Amino acid sequence: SPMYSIITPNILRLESEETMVLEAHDAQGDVPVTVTVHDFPGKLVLSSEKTVLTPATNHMGNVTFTIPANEFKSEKGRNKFVTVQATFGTQVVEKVVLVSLQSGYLFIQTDKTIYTPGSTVLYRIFTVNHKLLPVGRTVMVNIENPEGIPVKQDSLSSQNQLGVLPLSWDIPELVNMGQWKIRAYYENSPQQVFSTEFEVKEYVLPSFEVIVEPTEKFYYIYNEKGLEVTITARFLYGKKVEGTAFVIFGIQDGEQRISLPESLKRIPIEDGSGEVVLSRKVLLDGVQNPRAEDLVGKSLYVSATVILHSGSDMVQAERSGIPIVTSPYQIHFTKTPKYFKPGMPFDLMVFVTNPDGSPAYRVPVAVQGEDTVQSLTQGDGVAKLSINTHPSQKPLSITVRTKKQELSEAEQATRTMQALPYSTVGNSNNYLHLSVLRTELRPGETLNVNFLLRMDRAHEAKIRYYTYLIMNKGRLLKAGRQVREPGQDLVVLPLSITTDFIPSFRLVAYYTLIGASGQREVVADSVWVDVKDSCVGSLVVKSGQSEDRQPVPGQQMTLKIEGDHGARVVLVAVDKGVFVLNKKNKLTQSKIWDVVEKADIGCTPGSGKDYAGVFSDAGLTFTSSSGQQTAQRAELQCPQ
Amino acid sequence: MTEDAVDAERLKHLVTPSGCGEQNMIGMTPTVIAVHYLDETEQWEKFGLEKRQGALELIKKGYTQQLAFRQPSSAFAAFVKRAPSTWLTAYVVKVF
Numbered sequence: 001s002p003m004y005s006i007i008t009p010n011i012l013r014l015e016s017e018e019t020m021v022l023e024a025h026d027a028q029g030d031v032p033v034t035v036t037v038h039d040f041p042g043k044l045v046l047s048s049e050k051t052v053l054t055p056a057t058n059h060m061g062n063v064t065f066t067i068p069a070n071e072f073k074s075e076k077g078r079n080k081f082v083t084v085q086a087t088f089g090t091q092v093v094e095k096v097v098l099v100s101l102q103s104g105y106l107f108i109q110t111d112k113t114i115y116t117p118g119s120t121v122l123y124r125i126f127t128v129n130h131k132l133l134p135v136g137r138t139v140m141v142n143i144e145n146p147e148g149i150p151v152k153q154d155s156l157s158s159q160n161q162l163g164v165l166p167l168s169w170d171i172p173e174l175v176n177m178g179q180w181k182i183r184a185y186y187e188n189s190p191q192q193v194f195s196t197e198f199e200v201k202e203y204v205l206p207s208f209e210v211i212v213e214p215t216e217k218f219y220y221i222y223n224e225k226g227l228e229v230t231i232t233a234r235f236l237y238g239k240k241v242e243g244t245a246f247v248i249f250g251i252q253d254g255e256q257r258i259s260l261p262e263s264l265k266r267i268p269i270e271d272g273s274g275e276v277v278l279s280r281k282v283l284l285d286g287v288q289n290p291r292a293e294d295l296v297g298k299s300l301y302v303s304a305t306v307i308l309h310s311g312s313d314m315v316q317a318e319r320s321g322i323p324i325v326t327s328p329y330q331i332h333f334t335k336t337p338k339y340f341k342p343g344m345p346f347d348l349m350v351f352v353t354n355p356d357g358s359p360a361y362r363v364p365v366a367v368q369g370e371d372t373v374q375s376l377t378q379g380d381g382v383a384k385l386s387i388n389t390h391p392s393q394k395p396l397s398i399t400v401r402t403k404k405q406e407l408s409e410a411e412q413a414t415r416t417m418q419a420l421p422y423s424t425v426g427n428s429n430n431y432l433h434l435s436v437l438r439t440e441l442r443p444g445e446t447l448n449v450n451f452l453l454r455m456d457r458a459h460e461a462k463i464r465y466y467t468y469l470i471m472n473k474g475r476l477l478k479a480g481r482q483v484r485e486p487g488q489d490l491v492v493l494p495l496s497i498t499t500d501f502i503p504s505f506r507l508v509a510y511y512t513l514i515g516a517s518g519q520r521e522v523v524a525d526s527v528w529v530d531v532k533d534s535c536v537g538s539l540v541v542k543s544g545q546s547e548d549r550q551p552v553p554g555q556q557m558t559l560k561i562e563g564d565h566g567a568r569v570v571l572v573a574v575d576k577g578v579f580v581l582n583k584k585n586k587l588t589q590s591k592i593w594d595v596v597e598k599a600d601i602g603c604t605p606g607s608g609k610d611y612a613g614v615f616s617d618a619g620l621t622f623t624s625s626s627g628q629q630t631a632q633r634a635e636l637q638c639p640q
Numbered sequence: 641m642t643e644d645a646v647d648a649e650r651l652k653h654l655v656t657p658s659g660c661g662e663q664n665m666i667g668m669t670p671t672v673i674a675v676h677y678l679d680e681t682e683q684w685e686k687f688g689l690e691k692r693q694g695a696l697e698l699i700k701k702g703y704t705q706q707l708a709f710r711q712p713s714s715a716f717a718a719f720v721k722r723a724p725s726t727w728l729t730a731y732v733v734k735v736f
């Protein structure tokens with residue numbers, strides 16, 4: 001009784017290439033296959049892209065199609081579904097999948113970050129699709145007042161513009177101040193909107209940047225020395241500043257800011273560096289709660305005002321978010337799988353972070369039990385830990401604690417997790433572990449997964465291959481077999497990681513046997529791998545000259561751009577005084593990758609309650625003619 | 641200014657077609673009206689996405705059976721030998 005399976009992304013998209021991997025396990029001879037998609041309910045958006053399966057490919061194929069968007073725009077407030085009904089020879093299998101309206105991203109770039117009234121606004125609107133490629137679509141833009149009333153409306157097409165839409169606006173003279181907003185959204189999907197904020201203010205450009213970085217990015221509550229903050233001031237163009245600097249400290253809880261009257265100090269800066277300390281007596285007396293412990297959680301904030309001895313220019317710089325904490329580390333379980341397998345290593349990805357949020361570097365972690373295990377964090381703040389598991393059904397209570405030296409035991413950071421066992425089909429004890437290296441992988445270097453297996457010797461001849469899939473950015477990227485000769489128990493599959501795998505790929509896998517009374521079963525696994533976040537291509541700007549540095553104003557210089565052939569670059573030069581005055585709402589690769597990762601369908605970093613759970617966690621939909629099919633999804637976001 | 645429709649949580653009891661023409665009508669009418677109501681109210685998200693295909697298959701089977709049971713004069717009755725019934729023909733017209 002051969003099976004026929006369809007594996008498709010859990011939520012479909014409009015006007016994009018969506019892949020549906022087709023397998024026919026234990027099938028003899030060629031089988032025609034036709035895939036048709038119909039609207040749900042009712043009945044034919046597309047019925048094209050049929051295929052012929054051959055044993056030359058080991059009976060595996062993929063059918064890619066792009067569903068037209070039309071019936072789709074009539075109703076949007078309630079989720080809409082489509083039915084993917086495919087016929088394998090004379091056997092028909094169908095599955096209802098959700099369809100989203102999101103079709104691409106709009107990254108808005110404004111040249112400056114603060115404008116004065118009577119000055120023109122120059123901004124661009126990049127148009128890219130889910131795969132980060134230029135697309136031709138129609139956009140709408142509305143520029144909002146501080147109160148939120150549109151002031152300008154426009155419609156543009158990205159056709160033949162290579163995904164860049166330069167635009168303009170001349171700010172009216174009589175306008176309200178404060179944050180403005182620019183909201184742009186694709187014309188087909190008006191319920192998803194992207195935005196940026198630019199500030200209209202009365203300003204004249206400053207002359208020098210003031211940096212306040214405390215010695216530690218926190219304040220120990222029991223430290224008797226007080227907060228140690230260093231104020232440094234350098235001119236814009238690279239010279240040291242002489243002046244006098246006022247500073248002040250306060251306690252920032254929730255949204256109310258209270259200042260410390262006994263804290264303002266004048267600390268003259270010589271050679272552009274000054275240091276002031278907030279004695280703990282001041283901190284305790286300023287607040288009305290003498291209990292020092294009850295002050296934890298609240299954040300300090302440093303407001304530094306610098307004036308030159310000329311007295312001609314004044315600049316303000318503020319560093320907030322200095323958390324008052326009793327422990328310098330915060331242990332997170334965001335990346336650790338929440339489900340494990342009996343009798344396998346259970347790789348823990350602990351994420352040791354500083355109290356502010358930045359990743360921690362070179363900190364030893366340990367497990368409270370079996371203290372013989374100890375590790376040390378990598379560059380990105382993830383420490384690989386391995387805990388062997390007894391073959392038992394009881395939930396495993398894993399607690400991890402930081403064991404840094406020269407830190408008192410009443411001062412480390414602790415955390416606890418509950419991990420539940422993978423549940424087989426009818427207690428058959430047929431699992432699959434998929435061991436792998438997880439590090440700051442760079443594109444190009446290979447990876448060796450370990451298709452580890454565990455099953456009784458009575459059924460070691462039925463399994464001869466391992467199917468695997470690779471999610472990335474929301475669509476299947478690669479899908480192939482992995483042959484394994486019977487009698488072999490570990491299989492290493494070399495994976496060629498190109499630059500196309502940025503930033504993460506959710507490798508899955510499965511096999512299929514018949515056992516017990518002769519009922520079909522499926523066993524799956526998942527792995528989340530984090531790749532270093534950089535371009536899929538490469539671009540960098542440097543200077544043509546190799547001599548006679550510090551160009552004088554009015555002098556030609558040549559800047560060299562080393563970009564990929566055929567590409568198009570867009571340039572902008574901003575005075576650094578603007579960033580001194582307001583450094584928020586910039587654009588960089590980090591935010592682009594954050595936005596792309598925030599839209600991934602998968603919603604758990606690997607493993608699951610069982611095979612249906614594993615597939616839904618990955619963001620897939622595995623249905624078969626026999627009946628073993630994944631659970632239905634009808635919500636855009638997985639539960640928090 | 642509107643009244644919320646039934647959540648259809650308890651409408652799960654709504655039968656495979658079988659029997660003669662009258663029994664086939666008895667089978668199809670509740671299932672057909674239930675699927676029509678669910679389509680109108682757009683509440684398939686919670687009643688269960690999979691059951692609609694089975695409902696369509698069974699109603700199509702019943703429709704094909706009654707198409708086979710149609711008299712040569714385009715008449716619907718309990719039996720082909722039995723005289724056609726006007727009420728049965730009108731009900732079949734309404735169902736179609």
Ligand SMILES: *[C@@H]1O[C@H](CO)[C@@H](O)[C@H](O)[C@H]1NC(C)=O
Pocket residue numbers: 061062063064477478479
């Ligand atoms: C199916 O996936 C393979 C992966 O190597 C790819 O080469 C092929 O183009 C895909 N099929 C289609 C129709 O795109």
